[PDB]
RNA sequence: CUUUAAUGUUUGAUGUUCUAACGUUGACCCGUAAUCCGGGUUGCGGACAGUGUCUGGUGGGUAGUUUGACUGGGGCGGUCU
RNA sequence: AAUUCCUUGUCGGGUAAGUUCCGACCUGCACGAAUGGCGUAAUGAUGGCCAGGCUGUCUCCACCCGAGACUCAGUGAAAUU
RNA sequence: GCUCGCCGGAAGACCAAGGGUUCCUGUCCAACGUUAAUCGGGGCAGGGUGAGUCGACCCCUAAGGCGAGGCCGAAAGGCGUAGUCGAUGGGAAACAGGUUAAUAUUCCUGUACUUGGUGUUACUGCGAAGGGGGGACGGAGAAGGCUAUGUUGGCCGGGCGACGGUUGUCCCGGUUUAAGCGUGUAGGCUGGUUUUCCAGGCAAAUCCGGAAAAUCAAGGCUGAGGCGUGAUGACGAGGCACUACGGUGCUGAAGCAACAAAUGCCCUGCUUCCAGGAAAAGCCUCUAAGCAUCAGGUAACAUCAAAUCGUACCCCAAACCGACACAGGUGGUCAGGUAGAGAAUACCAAGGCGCUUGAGAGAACUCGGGUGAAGGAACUAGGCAAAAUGGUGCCGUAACUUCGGGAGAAGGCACGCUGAUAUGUAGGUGAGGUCCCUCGCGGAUGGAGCUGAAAUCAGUCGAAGAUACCAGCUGGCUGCAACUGUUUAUUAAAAACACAGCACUGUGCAAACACGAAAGUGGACGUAUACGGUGUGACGCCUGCCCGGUGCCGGAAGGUUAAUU
RNA sequence: AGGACCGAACCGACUAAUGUUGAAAAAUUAGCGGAUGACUUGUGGCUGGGGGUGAAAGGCCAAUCAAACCGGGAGAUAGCU
């Protein structure tokens, strides 16, 4: 479950850890893996384009099914995996013909069970189907937007929508988020929550414990002088200023979104 | 103490070599400088 | 002349539907041995979004500069016809 | 008080003698609650103070061992004027 | 040449990068060498680098670069697809001895191995720009089996000692051998085989994947080392004769066992943890269009080929980077004896050096050290500097605490040598012999030999037994920052930065944001348990009043207000 | 197990002395910190000057940095010496 560990040093005492002993413990499946290099957050003109990205560890890419295609042809769960690219966990599945995938495992969802995508497809967890074929007010995760272009809402671990009302060639999704949106009836989703939802209560407890997952230190704006920060400057702690980004827009309060050929789908903002 | 020259060939023909200097409209503008002054040796390429 | 209800009056705006300009970082076929690009079929959006010229506001993000003289040293105070 | 000018404020401890230290008072020139307030085990080539041991740090210096300085042969500079 | 001193985890030996004739021989001493010079990394002349197996070249790719068309941009140009380059990584094969003044895994002697072409013979279905497998991958930890290597004994050769003794339980030296070929061992992984079927692997597949029966349970893969051979060989102390004294030619004894033992091998193993640990080709297998007597594939024998370029020397430095024959810097490999936990430290082996001015004297003063009567911080801004402490085993140990710590707190006792327990103990290792045996790199019993702590009792020497080198000073009160870390290369290492944790706010994905005249790219092959910005800075208790001003968010009755007309 | 403890190689740079026309345009000597990690290191690549990178000192960008170096406008201008 979620532990803490003992204080035999100063960098053990606040770290807390998440553990499933579910998860399996040898190779990934050599076929459905890839390479991604890091890239420090630097462009094509080499240039750092986001600040704070840089070192870690090694990982490799887990081509996981997010349009979920093939219908009518059942499938098995095998086991749930680790996969250093995302908060979820991921679940390998075999299906009758001799195929194997990747999907993201929803909460609940263990080795055995059976799977199924498609129109006629049971309202069970794990199961894909158009908006149209479920039930108004059931919980989906791994939402299209466009149909036949991949699950690409509701993905992170513990998240999931639900659909509140179907008006027409739409129906209307409130998100995590917290805000109402339209998308068509047409789009698929996968019922049911994603698992990992523990995933949030560990403590890091060690600045290098970060370190280890690709972040740099922050500093701030304070702490510089004024050549380099809107903010810096001072003889003592002096601000005197209203608080900017570093390239001085307004960083407290003031709405950055401008998108005009979007807004027809909102219902109402996240508030 | 370490000076701030470390030599390396492979390194020094990369940057300065004669393909280099070719290969950017810049770069051969070097070598018509160099030719009008009368140089024995263009580049590094020795 | 005013406080008024109403047909007919020159427009100014605010909405709704349409497809044919236009957008597509949706799907399929071809060039083709290709996650580029172009062409074709279709779904979605649709005269909106987006770009050009003109124009009111904002704009130390950036740029060029100014910030007087007298003075029992300079500054503060005072003076300048 | 890393903050208190007057100021070595006043009282208690430590010293034969303590502008520094520790515990208090409140009259806070001019503390104060995420430009965070008050505590806090462990940690520190971090600032201040006090003891034990130890000593040429000192009263107050003496002798000894090596490398120069000194004489002889060879080579042979510099600032400045 | 004989003595003396110094290094010896280096001041020894070998590679890379970098340099380019500094390498060896003969000759010369003007200039160079911080002095002289017969000497030299100096001047002049001549000589010296030998590869199918080592490296490059070659095949394959990473980060990245270039980029036919293409998209974009006043021009120059930017990005990028198909492709093509790019090691620091993956891909076939050689070892021992001898020799030159100077090269050698390259030459010679002995014994090997690899990849291709061609021919003959005997069989046979071959075929890719495609499919599948493999190549192919992290950190830490533990143990077992070994070897490189060392020590002792045995054997062989020589010795009988400048001054008391030395025919013995005495002294000195040697006791070496490779690749390859055969066997398959300690260990590690995995059930095997045969039939039928199939929405998958861009088409096909007999191959991979999936499903169902039968049947047998032992098959397969991998693997250090040992043994045999290689090898009746080579090497070998020493002796024998010249010596033109620099070296030549000849013969050549023994050539074994026990114990200890790596940070090297089995091991790309095994156990465990989260931060979840390259790509492509060579290699194996399957077929598509095609060919069918053919062409191709397999095997045996024979024969041919393996081109080109580097190869001298500098070995952490007098030859590279520092203007210098410069107390500086420079990546990897090897790793003997005694003491020791040790690659620390002391003394030595092999090997290499005494650092390119010397000779005297023995003043002040300066530099680096040794000792010091009585006192013991009285010195000084300040115990700055120096002095002191320092090891192992056992006993013992306070406030406070986040229950881990504080703590090696503080403090006390023992420590050499000899004898006995025990002519060497506990333990370790284990030969002949006996029995079985699916006879063999086996199993059971057995103890010869070898190695070997610690402890107790008695005696004994010194002023001193952790005797040298090496090797914590300790305690009390308090400010700051929680801690490990980072910082002004060259006067500031800190209370400054970072940090885990907390909060506010923006962002619905063609996300906000950033680099870009643009095209594009990062954010992210991520999706609100996610990403950016801002402030505070573990943890405990908390975080109060004010919305006038200035920002930000929302509202719309009214005043004023641009181009335009 | 551990951004655990002691301590060599390796990486640093807290104190004192020497040196200061140095052996050295930043070192030597005696002590000092980390030493399984936010570690250290070899080879190659990428970011270009009002630009880059910065655990943030206006630090670093070839002994050069509150705006590198080279060439040009250029014989800039100098009520001053
Ligand atoms: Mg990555
Ligand atoms: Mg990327
Ligand atoms: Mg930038
Ligand atoms: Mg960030
Ligand atoms: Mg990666
Ligand atoms: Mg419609
Ligand atoms: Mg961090
Ligand atoms: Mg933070
Ligand atoms: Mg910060
Ligand atoms: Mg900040
Ligand atoms: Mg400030
Ligand atoms: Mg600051
Ligand atoms: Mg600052
Ligand atoms: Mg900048
Ligand atoms: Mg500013
Ligand atoms: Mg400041
Ligand atoms: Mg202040
Ligand atoms: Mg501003
Ligand atoms: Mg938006
Ligand atoms: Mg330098
Ligand atoms: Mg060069
Ligand atoms: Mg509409
Ligand atoms: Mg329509
Ligand atoms: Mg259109
Ligand atoms: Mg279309
Ligand atoms: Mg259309
Ligand atoms: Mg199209
Ligand atoms: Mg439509
Ligand atoms: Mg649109
Ligand atoms: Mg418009
Ligand atoms: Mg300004
Ligand atoms: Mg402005
Ligand atoms: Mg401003
Ligand atoms: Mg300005
Ligand atoms: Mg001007
Ligand atoms: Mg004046
Ligand atoms: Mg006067
Ligand atoms: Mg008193
Ligand atoms: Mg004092
Ligand atoms: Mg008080
Ligand atoms: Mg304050
Ligand atoms: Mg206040
Ligand atoms: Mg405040
Ligand atoms: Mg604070
Ligand atoms: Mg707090
Ligand atoms: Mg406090
Ligand atoms: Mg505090
Ligand atoms: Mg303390
Ligand atoms: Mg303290
Ligand atoms: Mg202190
Ligand atoms: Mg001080
Ligand atoms: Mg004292
Ligand atoms: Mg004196
Ligand atoms: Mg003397
Ligand atoms: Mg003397
Ligand atoms: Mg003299
Ligand atoms: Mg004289
Ligand atoms: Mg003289
Ligand atoms: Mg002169
Ligand atoms: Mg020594
Ligand atoms: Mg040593
Ligand atoms: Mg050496
Ligand atoms: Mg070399
Ligand atoms: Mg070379
Ligand atoms: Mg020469
Ligand atoms: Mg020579
Ligand atoms: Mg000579
Ligand atoms: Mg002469
Ligand atoms: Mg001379
Ligand atoms: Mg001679
Ligand atoms: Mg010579
Ligand atoms: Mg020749
Ligand atoms: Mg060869
Ligand atoms: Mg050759
Ligand atoms: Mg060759
Ligand atoms: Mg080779
Ligand atoms: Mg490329
Ligand atoms: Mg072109
Ligand atoms: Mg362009
Ligand atoms: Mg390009
Ligand atoms: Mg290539
Ligand atoms: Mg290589
Ligand atoms: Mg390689
Ligand atoms: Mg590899
Ligand atoms: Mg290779
Ligand atoms: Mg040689
Ligand atoms: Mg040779
Ligand atoms: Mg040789
Ligand atoms: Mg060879
Ligand atoms: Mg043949
Ligand atoms: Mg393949
Ligand atoms: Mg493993
Ligand atoms: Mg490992
Ligand atoms: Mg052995
Ligand atoms: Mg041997
Ligand atoms: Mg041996
Ligand atoms: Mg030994
Ligand atoms: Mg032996
Ligand atoms: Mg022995
Ligand atoms: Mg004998
Ligand atoms: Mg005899
Ligand atoms: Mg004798
Ligand atoms: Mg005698
Ligand atoms: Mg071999
Ligand atoms: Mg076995
Ligand atoms: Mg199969
Ligand atoms: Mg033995
Ligand atoms: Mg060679
Ligand atoms: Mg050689
Ligand atoms: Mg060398
Ligand atoms: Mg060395
Ligand atoms: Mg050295
Ligand atoms: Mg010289
Ligand atoms: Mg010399
Ligand atoms: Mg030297
Ligand atoms: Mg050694
Ligand atoms: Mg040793
Ligand atoms: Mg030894
Ligand atoms: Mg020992
Ligand atoms: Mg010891
Ligand atoms: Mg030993
Ligand atoms: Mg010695
Ligand atoms: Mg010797
Ligand atoms: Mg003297
Ligand atoms: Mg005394
Ligand atoms: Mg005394
Ligand atoms: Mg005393
Ligand atoms: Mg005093
Ligand atoms: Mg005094
Ligand atoms: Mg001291
Ligand atoms: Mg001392
Ligand atoms: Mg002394
Ligand atoms: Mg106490
Ligand atoms: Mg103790
Ligand atoms: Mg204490
Ligand atoms: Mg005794
Ligand atoms: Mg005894
Ligand atoms: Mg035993
Ligand atoms: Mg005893
Ligand atoms: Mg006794
Ligand atoms: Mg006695
Ligand atoms: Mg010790
Ligand atoms: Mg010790
Ligand atoms: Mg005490
Ligand atoms: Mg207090
Ligand atoms: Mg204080
Ligand atoms: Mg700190
Ligand atoms: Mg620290
Ligand atoms: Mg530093
Ligand atoms: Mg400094
Ligand atoms: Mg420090
Ligand atoms: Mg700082
Ligand atoms: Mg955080
Ligand atoms: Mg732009
Ligand atoms: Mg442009
Ligand atoms: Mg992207
Ligand atoms: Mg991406
Ligand atoms: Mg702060
Ligand atoms: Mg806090
Ligand atoms: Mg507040
Ligand atoms: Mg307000
Ligand atoms: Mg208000
Ligand atoms: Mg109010
Ligand atoms: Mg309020
Ligand atoms: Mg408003
Ligand atoms: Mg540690
Ligand atoms: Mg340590
Ligand atoms: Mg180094
Ligand atoms: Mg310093
Ligand atoms: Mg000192
Ligand atoms: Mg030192
Ligand atoms: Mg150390
Ligand atoms: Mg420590
Ligand atoms: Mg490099
Ligand atoms: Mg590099
Ligand atoms: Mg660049
Ligand atoms: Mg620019
Ligand atoms: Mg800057
Ligand atoms: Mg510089
Ligand atoms: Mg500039
Ligand atoms: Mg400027
Ligand atoms: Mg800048
Ligand atoms: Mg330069
Ligand atoms: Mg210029
Ligand atoms: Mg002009
Ligand atoms: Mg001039």
């Given at each position: 479950?979620?532990?803490?560990?003992?204080?035999?040093?100063?960098?053990?005492?606040?770290?807390?850890?998440?553990?499933?002993?579910?998860?399996?413990?040898?190779?990934?499946?050599?076929?459905?893996?890839?390479?991604?290099?890091?890239?420090?957050?630097?462009?094509?003109?080499?240039?750092?384009?986001?600040?704070?990205?840089?070192?870690?560890?090694?990982?490799?890419?887990?081509?996981?099914?997010?349009?979920?295609?093939?219908?009518?042809?059942?499938?098995?769960?095998?086991?749930?995996?680790?996969?250093?690219?995302?908060?979820?966990?991921?679940?390998?599945?075999?299906?009758?013909?001799?195929?194997?995938?990747?999907?993201?495992?929803?909460?609940?969802?263990?080795?055995?069970?059976?799977?199924?995508?498609?129109?006629?497809?049971?309202?069970?967890?794990?199961?894909?189907?158009?908006?149209?074929?479920?039930?108004?007010?059931?919980?989906?995760?791994?939402?299209?937007?466009?149909?036949?272009?991949?699950?690409?809402?509701?993905?992170?671990?513990?998240?999931?929508?639900?659909?509140?009302?179907?008006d027409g060639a739409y129906v209307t999704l409130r998100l995590r988020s917290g805000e109402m949106r339209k998308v068509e009836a047409d789009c698929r989703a996968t019922l049911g929550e994603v698992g990992n939802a523990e995933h949030?209560?560990?403590?890091?407890?060690?600045?290098?414990?970060?370190?280890?997952?690709?972040?740099?230190?922050?500093?701030?704006?304070?702490?510089?002088?004024?050549?380099?920060?809107?903010?810096?400057?001072?003889?003592?702690?002096?601000?005197?200023?209203?608080?900017?980004?570093?390239?001085?827009?307004?960083?407290?309060?003031?709405?950055?979104?401008?998108?005009?050929?979007?807004?027809?789908?909102?219902?109402?903002?996240?508030? | 103490?370490?000076?701030?020259?470390?030599?390396?060939?492979?390194?020094?023909?990369?940057?300065?070599?004669?393909?280099?200097?070719?290969?950017?409209?810049?770069?051969?503008?070097?070598?018509?400088?160099?030719?009008?002054?009368?140089?024995?040796?263009?580049?590094?390429?020795?």
């Amino acid at each position: 479950a979620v532990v803490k560990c003992k204080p035999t040093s100063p960098g053990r005492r606040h770290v807390v850890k998440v553990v499933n002993p579910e998860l399996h413990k040898g190779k990934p499946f050599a076929p459905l893996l890839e390479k991604n290099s890091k890239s420090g957050g630097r462009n094509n003109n080499g240039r750092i384009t986001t600040r704070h990205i840089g070192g870690g560890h090694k990982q490799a890419y887990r081509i996981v099914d997010f349009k979920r295609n093939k219908d009518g042809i059942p499938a098995v769960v095998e086991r749930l995996e680790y996969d250093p690219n995302r908060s979820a966990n991921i679940a390998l599945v075999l299906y009758k013909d001799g195929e194997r995938r990747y999907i993201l495992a929803p909460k609940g969802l263990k080795a055995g069970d059976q799977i199924q995508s498609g129109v006629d497809a049971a309202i069970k967890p794990g199961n894909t189907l158009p908006m149209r074929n479920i039930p108004v007010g059931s919980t989906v995760h791994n939402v299209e937007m466009k149909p036949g272009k991949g699950g690409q809402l509701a993905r992170s671990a513990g998240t999931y929508v639900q659909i509140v009302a179907r008006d027409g060639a739409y129906v209307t999704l409130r998100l995590r988020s917290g805000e109402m949106r339209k998308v068509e009836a047409d789009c698929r989703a996968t019922l049911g929550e994603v698992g990992n939802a523990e995933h949030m209560l560990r403590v890091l407890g060690k600045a290098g414990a970060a370190r280890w997952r690709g972040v740099r230190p922050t500093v701030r704006g304070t702490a510089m002088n004024p050549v380099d920060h809107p903010h810096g400057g001072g003889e003592g702690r002096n601000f005197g200023k209203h608080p900017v980004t570093p390239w001085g827009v307004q960083t407290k309060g003031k709405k950055t979104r401008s998108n005009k050929r979007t807004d027809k789908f909102i219902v109402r903002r996240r508030s | 103490m370490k000076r701030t020259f470390q030599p390396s060939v492979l390194k020094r023909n990369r940057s300065h070599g004669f393909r280099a200097r070719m290969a950017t409209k810049n770069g051969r503008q070097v070598l018509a400088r160099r030719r009008a002054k009368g140089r024995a040796r263009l580049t590094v390429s020795k």
